[PDB]
Amino acid sequence: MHPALWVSKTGLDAQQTNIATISNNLANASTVGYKKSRAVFEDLFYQNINQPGGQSSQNTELPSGLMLGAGSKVVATQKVHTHGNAQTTTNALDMMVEGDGFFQVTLPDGNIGYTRNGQFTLNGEGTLVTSGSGYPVEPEIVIPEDAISITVGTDGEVSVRVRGQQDNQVVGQLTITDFVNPGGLEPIGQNLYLPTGASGDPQEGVPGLDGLGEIRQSMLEASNVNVTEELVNMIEAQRVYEMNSKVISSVDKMMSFVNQQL
Amino acid sequence: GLGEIRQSMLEASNVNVTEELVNMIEAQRVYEMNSKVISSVDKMMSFVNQQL
Amino acid sequence: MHPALWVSKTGLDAQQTNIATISNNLANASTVGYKKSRAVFEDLFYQNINQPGGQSSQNTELPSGLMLGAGSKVVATQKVHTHGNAQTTTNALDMMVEGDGFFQVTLPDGNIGYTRNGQFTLNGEGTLVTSGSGYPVEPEIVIPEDAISITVGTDGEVSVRVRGQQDNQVVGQLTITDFVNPGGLEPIGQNLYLPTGASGDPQEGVPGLDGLGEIRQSMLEASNVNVTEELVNMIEAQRVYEMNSKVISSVDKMMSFVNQQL
Amino acid sequence: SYVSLSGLSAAQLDLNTTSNNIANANTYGFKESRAEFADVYSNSLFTNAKTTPGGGAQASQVAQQFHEGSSIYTNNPMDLRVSGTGFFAVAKERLTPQQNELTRNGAFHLNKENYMVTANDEFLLGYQVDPSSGEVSSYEPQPINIPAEFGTGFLTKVDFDENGSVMGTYSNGENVTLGRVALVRVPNEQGLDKKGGTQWDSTQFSGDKIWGESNKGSFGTINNGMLEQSNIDMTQELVDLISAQRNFQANSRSLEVHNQLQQNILQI
């Protein structure tokens, strides 16, 4: 009915998406290996009423044209893939990637999913799996029943010590995958990511060579959410939300006045 | 292409109360304005009957 | 007068039912053996103005049809029959079921009611009755006047101790009943339930065999209500309640406008 | 608003898990728990893929951290402890020892029939060895009995060596080996389902029970006169209380903001 009604509708939607993104960041303030997200704002197309640069008389062009905007929207939810802090734990099977890299697991459909969460465990067969849905870790790491301890090297070599045997036996070799643009990964939930077109090809290697990060045993990577920043951004987004409703309130009152008068 | 089953989780309604209420603002105003035309035509036909 | 008036009326009643259920949980926040209830919503029938999938022409059928809903309602109030926390008390006549099961009491009409509330006591005859209205427990457990200490076993074996006589003297045996669908039980007040058609046949047995819970003497079962959940849900239901009042308020204003113009 | 409630639910679960650890700061054999959370990202065919706000936080699993707990010294030969990996095998019924559960507390005593039982009158299981033989003859677990008279001679002292063998000396000066305590291990300890009284049972996620002797293979040793306290750290639990409250308050602020947005439109 009114141009300002639709423009402010896009303003309300944009701030709702921003607040929803911030609210999700606060929810995952204790999720291990979580990467915070920020909303990216941009203005929509501008209606061309008067063309800027139009030849308003010879040797005279419109310095500024009448161009009415169509509002704003959140164009992307950019993942901030910066490193989180390290939590020292006593568990021998929870690991951390110190630097660039992702743990790779086998999804039930057969594809390989990449995760930053290092909270791992074992199943009844001793295969190293995740502590959530129990996805096997690629490549499979089978801990023998004769092991008395587990040590995961910086280079990812998983070794165990057997009673009555020096020179601990190697039972596996971890490989981690890096991405040129980790922010382009598709979050599929359960602290897992899937490669996309904008993510780049998955490049695999030993964890500590070719720029890959190191594997830190008995250590967890905390989420990188800054609660101070999230709460301040929550207040600002609320203010922009309320001032857009004032335009709708003003437009609604104008239409009510016109109907009674005109 | 089928979705996954998530135990101990529920799917809330996808309605956006922000969109519905602003749509109510538009719907009420356009409804009133179309009533203005009928009232205007009603007065026009009354004027013609009395004059013509 | 208006389709929106009736649809929002059903919405108002659905939220009034939801808040009433929530308020009931808060009221019974300290009741022993009380199971919180949750309201289940579902939409009503849809008017079939245009058939979805109907033929708009040959080789072309209507993709989506014009189907108007009739509102919503709370179709069921489901009891969340999850176990509550255990309270340790110095009373020897209050017991708890650790696991599935229900105590059995004799109603004044002669039927048997099932109760998770274990706060029992004695009447003048020494029969083990509930600490409320005084309904005797099935089977009768009468404490002799020579008893100096009352012990109730894990397997429900009730026994007392007598001066100058070694070995506890057995006085009775408690039995508890389970149901396939305890959520189908009928709440009749006074912390009592009744079996229904959807509850299933009552299965009685020794408390500790065939999947039954165990009797914990000097221990009571708190209510499973979480005031955090109830208060948060009550705020949400209040907002939805005000949503349907805006529709009714707008509909009333439209009819007022038409009464003056048309 | 559900995203904020997801944060409140996740934070409250963190409080409840920590409060459970603090409550059991004195129970023998307790293994602390850690609340693990996971993200929610649900999309459909008709949902825009560029902007993907999360669905909240989901409870992944309440872990069962199985690190060794500190030992207390009671100088009591009937109080036992496993130094290493392994659990004691305990059966509620003497007649059927197959229906057994795994425990870590070693507070045992003798019943009126002289069976080594737990505080709950649940019978400890062990291997049957001949008085003259050495290692285990039959590996099937049986309740451990320490006879009052063997010949005759009356029981005087009971002690356990590092191999778990229970040895009872009598008045006639005859030392007879009455058996050795059975030790149980599983490939996955965190997969065990938790019963009452600091006891576990075997599941499919935990693999099968591995019956073996103490100080043999991957099993640990058995020490008498010691008990294992809870494996919790008070300072860590108290700090986790601090961080969990400031995450319930931050999420509750998000819930408050969302409500005030809906109130804002209701006044137009």
Short mmCIF file of C-alpha atoms in Angstrom, two decimals, chain C residues 4-259:
data_model
loop_
_atom_site.label_atom_id
_atom_site.label_comp_id
_atom_site.label_asym_id
_atom_site.label_seq_id
_atom_site.Cartn_x
_atom_site.Cartn_y
_atom_site.Cartn_z
CA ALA C 4 -10.85 -14.32 11.25
CA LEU C 5 -13.00 -13.68 14.34
CA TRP C 6 -13.76 -17.37 14.82
CA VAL C 7 -10.27 -18.58 13.89
CA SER C 8 -8.63 -16.27 16.43
CA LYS C 9 -11.23 -17.27 19.03
CA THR C 10 -10.01 -20.86 18.73
CA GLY C 11 -6.47 -19.52 18.99
CA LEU C 12 -7.35 -17.63 22.18
CA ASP C 13 -8.96 -20.71 23.75
CA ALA C 14 -5.99 -22.89 22.77
CA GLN C 15 -3.57 -20.55 24.54
CA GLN C 16 -5.89 -20.16 27.54
CA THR C 17 -5.87 -23.95 27.87
CA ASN C 18 -2.07 -23.96 27.51
CA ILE C 19 -1.57 -21.30 30.19
CA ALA C 20 -4.02 -23.08 32.49
CA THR C 21 -1.98 -26.28 32.15
CA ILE C 22 1.24 -24.34 32.78
CA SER C 23 -0.28 -22.62 35.83
CA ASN C 24 -1.25 -26.05 37.17
CA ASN C 25 2.38 -27.21 37.01
CA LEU C 26 3.58 -24.13 38.89
CA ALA C 27 0.89 -24.60 41.55
CA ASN C 28 2.03 -28.20 42.10
CA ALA C 29 5.73 -27.28 42.22
CA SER C 30 6.24 -29.02 45.59
CA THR C 31 3.71 -31.85 45.28
CA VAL C 32 5.31 -35.25 45.88
CA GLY C 33 4.96 -37.63 42.95
CA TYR C 34 3.36 -35.10 40.59
CA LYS C 35 4.01 -35.41 36.85
CA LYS C 36 4.03 -32.22 34.79
CA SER C 37 1.62 -31.88 31.88
CA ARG C 38 2.21 -30.50 28.39
CA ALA C 39 -0.46 -29.25 26.00
CA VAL C 40 -0.45 -30.70 22.48
CA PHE C 41 -1.59 -28.35 19.71
CA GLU C 42 -3.04 -29.29 16.34
CA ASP C 43 -4.80 -27.33 13.62
CA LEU C 44 -8.47 -27.85 12.80
CA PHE C 45 -10.00 -28.75 9.44
CA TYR C 46 -9.39 -26.74 6.27
CA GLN C 47 -12.17 -25.37 4.08
CA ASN C 48 -11.74 -26.61 0.51
CA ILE C 49 -12.32 -23.60 -1.73
CA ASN C 50 -9.99 -24.72 -4.53
CA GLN C 51 -8.88 -28.35 -4.64
CA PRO C 52 -5.07 -28.74 -4.59
CA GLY C 53 -4.21 -31.03 -7.49
CA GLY C 54 -7.54 -30.37 -9.19
CA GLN C 55 -7.67 -29.93 -12.94
CA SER C 56 -7.21 -26.38 -14.19
CA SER C 57 -7.00 -27.91 -17.69
CA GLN C 58 -5.77 -31.07 -19.36
CA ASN C 59 -2.06 -31.70 -18.69
CA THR C 60 -2.15 -28.93 -16.05
CA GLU C 61 -3.41 -29.35 -12.48
CA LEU C 62 -3.61 -26.71 -9.74
CA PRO C 63 -0.28 -26.87 -7.87
CA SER C 64 -1.56 -25.25 -4.68
CA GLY C 65 -5.21 -24.72 -3.85
CA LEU C 66 -7.09 -22.15 -1.77
CA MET C 67 -7.62 -23.94 1.55
CA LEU C 68 -8.51 -21.83 4.59
CA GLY C 69 -7.83 -23.16 8.07
CA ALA C 70 -10.35 -23.11 10.90
CA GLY C 71 -7.93 -22.23 13.72
CA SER C 72 -6.22 -24.42 16.29
CA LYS C 73 -6.93 -26.23 19.54
CA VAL C 74 -5.18 -28.12 22.31
CA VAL C 75 -6.08 -31.71 21.48
CA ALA C 76 -4.44 -33.45 24.46
CA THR C 77 -2.73 -32.72 27.77
CA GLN C 78 0.07 -35.27 27.98
CA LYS C 79 1.61 -36.14 31.34
CA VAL C 80 5.41 -36.21 31.23
CA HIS C 81 5.85 -39.38 33.30
CA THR C 82 9.59 -39.02 33.80
CA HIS C 83 11.21 -39.87 37.12
CA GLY C 84 11.70 -37.10 39.66
CA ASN C 85 14.43 -36.47 42.19
CA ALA C 86 14.58 -38.38 45.47
CA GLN C 87 14.26 -36.59 48.81
CA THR C 88 15.75 -38.16 51.94
CA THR C 89 13.49 -37.90 54.99
CA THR C 90 13.69 -39.18 58.56
CA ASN C 91 10.15 -40.56 58.38
CA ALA C 92 10.02 -44.36 58.18
CA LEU C 93 6.47 -44.55 56.75
CA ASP C 94 7.12 -42.71 53.47
CA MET C 95 8.50 -44.72 50.55
CA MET C 96 9.46 -44.18 46.92
CA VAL C 97 9.45 -46.24 43.73
CA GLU C 98 12.90 -46.24 42.12
CA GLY C 99 11.81 -46.98 38.56
CA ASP C 100 8.52 -47.89 36.95
CA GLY C 101 5.57 -48.65 39.19
CA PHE C 102 2.67 -47.24 41.17
CA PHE C 103 1.47 -47.75 44.73
CA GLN C 104 -2.01 -49.22 45.19
CA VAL C 105 -4.70 -47.73 47.44
CA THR C 106 -8.34 -48.58 48.12
CA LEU C 107 -10.81 -45.86 47.19
CA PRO C 108 -14.02 -45.32 49.21
CA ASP C 109 -16.10 -46.72 46.33
CA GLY C 110 -14.03 -49.93 46.44
CA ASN C 111 -11.82 -49.44 43.38
CA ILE C 112 -8.01 -49.30 43.39
CA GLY C 113 -6.19 -46.06 42.64
CA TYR C 114 -2.55 -45.78 41.60
CA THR C 115 -0.34 -43.20 43.30
CA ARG C 116 3.29 -42.16 42.96
CA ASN C 117 2.97 -40.25 46.24
CA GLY C 118 4.48 -42.41 48.97
CA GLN C 119 3.70 -40.27 52.03
CA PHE C 120 1.91 -42.90 54.11
CA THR C 121 0.90 -43.09 57.76
CA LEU C 122 -1.14 -45.24 60.16
CA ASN C 123 -4.72 -45.02 61.38
CA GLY C 124 -5.87 -46.00 64.87
CA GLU C 125 -5.87 -49.68 63.88
CA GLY C 126 -2.28 -49.40 62.64
CA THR C 127 -3.12 -50.06 58.99
CA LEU C 128 -0.72 -48.40 56.56
CA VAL C 129 -2.81 -45.65 54.95
CA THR C 130 -2.01 -42.55 52.92
CA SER C 131 -1.15 -39.38 54.82
CA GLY C 132 -3.90 -37.44 53.04
CA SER C 133 -7.50 -38.66 52.99
CA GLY C 134 -6.47 -41.96 54.58
CA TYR C 135 -7.06 -44.54 51.86
CA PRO C 136 -5.67 -47.95 52.89
CA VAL C 137 -2.86 -49.46 50.82
CA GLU C 138 -3.55 -52.71 48.92
CA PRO C 139 -2.69 -55.26 50.24
CA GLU C 140 -3.31 -54.24 53.87
CA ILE C 141 -0.15 -53.73 55.93
CA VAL C 142 -1.14 -53.59 59.62
CA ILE C 143 1.65 -52.77 62.07
CA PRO C 144 1.33 -54.65 65.39
CA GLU C 145 1.39 -52.57 68.56
CA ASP C 146 4.46 -54.50 69.77
CA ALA C 147 6.68 -53.03 67.03
CA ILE C 148 9.64 -50.84 67.94
CA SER C 149 11.09 -50.22 64.46
CA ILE C 150 9.57 -50.65 60.99
CA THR C 151 11.68 -51.61 57.98
CA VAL C 152 10.49 -51.91 54.38
CA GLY C 153 12.70 -53.95 52.08
CA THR C 154 13.80 -53.21 48.54
CA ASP C 155 11.58 -56.07 47.33
CA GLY C 156 8.62 -54.58 49.23
CA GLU C 157 8.82 -56.98 52.18
CA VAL C 158 7.48 -55.07 55.18
CA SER C 159 8.75 -56.27 58.56
CA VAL C 160 8.94 -54.97 62.13
CA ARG C 161 11.21 -55.57 65.10
CA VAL C 162 10.02 -56.76 68.52
CA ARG C 163 11.69 -56.40 71.91
CA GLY C 164 13.35 -59.58 73.13
CA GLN C 165 13.07 -61.39 69.79
CA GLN C 166 15.86 -61.62 67.21
CA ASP C 167 15.11 -61.41 63.46
CA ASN C 168 12.62 -58.93 62.00
CA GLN C 169 9.03 -60.17 62.18
CA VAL C 170 7.39 -60.09 58.74
CA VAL C 171 4.04 -58.30 58.64
CA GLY C 172 3.22 -57.91 54.94
CA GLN C 173 4.35 -57.57 51.34
CA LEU C 174 3.99 -54.47 49.17
CA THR C 175 3.12 -54.81 45.49
CA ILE C 176 3.28 -52.09 42.84
CA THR C 177 1.59 -51.83 39.45
CA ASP C 178 3.00 -50.65 36.12
CA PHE C 179 1.38 -49.56 32.86
CA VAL C 180 2.51 -49.67 29.24
CA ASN C 181 1.19 -46.11 28.78
CA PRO C 182 1.13 -44.27 32.12
CA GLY C 183 0.31 -41.11 30.17
CA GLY C 184 -3.12 -42.59 29.50
CA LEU C 185 -3.96 -42.74 33.20
CA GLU C 186 -6.81 -40.57 34.44
CA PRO C 187 -5.87 -37.92 37.04
CA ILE C 188 -8.60 -37.98 39.70
CA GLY C 189 -6.99 -35.68 42.26
CA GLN C 190 -5.49 -36.37 45.69
CA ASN C 191 -2.33 -37.67 43.94
CA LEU C 192 -4.34 -40.62 42.59
CA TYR C 193 -4.68 -42.15 39.13
CA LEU C 194 -7.11 -44.58 37.53
CA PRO C 195 -6.61 -47.05 34.67
CA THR C 196 -8.21 -46.19 31.33
CA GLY C 197 -8.61 -47.80 27.93
CA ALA C 198 -5.50 -46.12 26.52
CA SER C 199 -3.47 -46.77 29.68
CA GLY C 200 -3.37 -50.55 29.28
CA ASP C 201 -4.10 -53.49 31.52
CA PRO C 202 -2.66 -53.20 35.05
CA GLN C 203 0.30 -55.53 35.56
CA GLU C 204 1.10 -56.26 39.21
CA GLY C 205 4.17 -57.94 40.63
CA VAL C 206 6.93 -57.88 43.21
CA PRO C 207 8.72 -54.51 43.40
CA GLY C 208 12.08 -55.38 41.87
CA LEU C 209 11.35 -58.18 39.40
CA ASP C 210 9.94 -58.21 35.86
CA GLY C 211 11.07 -54.62 35.30
CA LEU C 212 9.33 -53.10 38.33
CA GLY C 213 10.96 -50.43 40.45
CA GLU C 214 12.32 -50.86 43.95
CA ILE C 215 10.87 -49.52 47.20
CA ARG C 216 13.07 -46.89 48.85
CA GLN C 217 12.13 -46.43 52.50
CA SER C 218 12.56 -43.00 54.12
CA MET C 219 12.71 -41.42 50.66
CA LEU C 220 10.20 -39.34 48.71
CA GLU C 221 9.86 -38.53 45.01
CA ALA C 222 9.71 -34.83 44.18
CA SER C 223 7.69 -33.42 41.31
CA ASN C 224 9.39 -33.40 37.91
CA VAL C 225 8.22 -29.83 37.22
CA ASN C 226 10.93 -27.44 36.04
CA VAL C 227 9.84 -23.91 36.96
CA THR C 228 12.36 -22.60 34.42
CA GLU C 229 10.54 -24.38 31.59
CA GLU C 230 7.05 -23.52 32.83
CA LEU C 231 7.77 -19.80 33.23
CA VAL C 232 9.48 -19.53 29.84
CA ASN C 233 6.62 -21.36 28.11
CA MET C 234 4.04 -19.22 29.92
CA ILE C 235 5.67 -16.08 28.51
CA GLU C 236 5.53 -17.56 25.00
CA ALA C 237 1.88 -18.57 25.40
CA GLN C 238 1.07 -15.06 26.64
CA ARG C 239 2.56 -13.54 23.49
CA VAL C 240 0.58 -15.91 21.25
CA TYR C 241 -2.53 -15.00 23.25
CA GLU C 242 -1.99 -11.32 22.44
CA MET C 243 -1.38 -12.21 18.78
CA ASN C 244 -4.95 -13.46 18.35
CA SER C 245 -6.36 -10.45 20.20
CA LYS C 246 -4.79 -8.16 17.61
CA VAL C 247 -6.65 -10.06 14.89
CA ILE C 248 -9.94 -9.77 16.78
CA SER C 249 -9.29 -6.10 17.53
CA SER C 250 -8.53 -5.41 13.86
CA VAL C 251 -11.59 -7.38 12.74
CA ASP C 252 -13.78 -5.40 15.14
CA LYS C 253 -12.39 -2.11 13.79
CA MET C 254 -13.07 -3.21 10.21
CA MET C 255 -16.69 -4.05 11.03
CA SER C 256 -17.02 -0.69 12.80
CA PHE C 257 -15.62 1.05 9.72
CA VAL C 258 -18.06 -0.81 7.45
CA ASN C 259 -21.00 0.02 9.73
#
